[PDB]
Ligand binder design. Structure first.
Ligand SMILES: CC(C)[C@H](N)C(=O)O
Ligand SMILES: CC(C)[C@H](N)C(=O)O
Ligand code: NA
Ligand code: NA
Ligand code: NA
Ligand code: NA
Ligand code: NA
Ligand code: NA
Ligand code: NA
Ligand code: NA
Ligand code: NA
Ligand code: NA
Lengths: 86, 86
């Protein structure tokens, strides 16, 4: 199964809240590449520790640009990019 | 230039209103193929006179399925599919 790429939880100390993202925001693209579902967001974020990514986001009928500075979480094999959203 | 695929006008006697579409609806896909912008909607509708097409549409945060029965308008070279929306 797959889910729409809509934010339902935010880490108050994480990158997504710092970037101005909000519950209910729907991610449309990351660095110009459409995101088809939430798992695509997870996979792309995890692969990009420490990287700035450019989002297009839909919020209440308006398409917005958002710059998101991914953090780093985990150790060894598990070290991954982190956005602070679910 | 391009525009998001959002309905801003509807023919009260046309297929889109009959299908249950509403101002502000955002078309996401036609027959499972993403629509990137409004011109893609125009081109796909015009090419499909008389055809039923399956839409995914975003309305106020909810993804909806909509079956749209395209009509026919125009004569000769200009004969085209018609959805009744702008
Ligand atoms: C998006 C995913 C990788 C994770 N839930 C995070 O906050 O980064
Ligand atoms: C979508 C386009 C082809 C036209 N405005 C129509 O109503 O069909
Ligand atoms: Na969606
Ligand atoms: Na950020
Ligand atoms: Na990954
Ligand atoms: Na929206
Ligand atoms: Na941006
Ligand atoms: Na859009
Ligand atoms: Na119809
Ligand atoms: Na066409
Ligand atoms: Na919406
Ligand atoms: Na449908």
């Amino acid at each position: 199964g797959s889910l729409p790429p809509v934010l339902a939880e935010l880490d108050p100390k994480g990158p997504a809240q710092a970037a101005g993202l909000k519950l209910g925001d729907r991610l449309q693209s990351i660095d110009g590449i459409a995101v088809d579902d939430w798992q695509q967001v997870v996979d792309s974020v995890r692969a990009r520790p420490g990287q700035r990514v450019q989002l297009k986001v839909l919020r209440d009928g308006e398409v917005l640009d958002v710059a998101l500075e991914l953090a780093v979480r985990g150790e060894g094999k598990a070290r991954s990019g982190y956005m602070g959203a679910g």
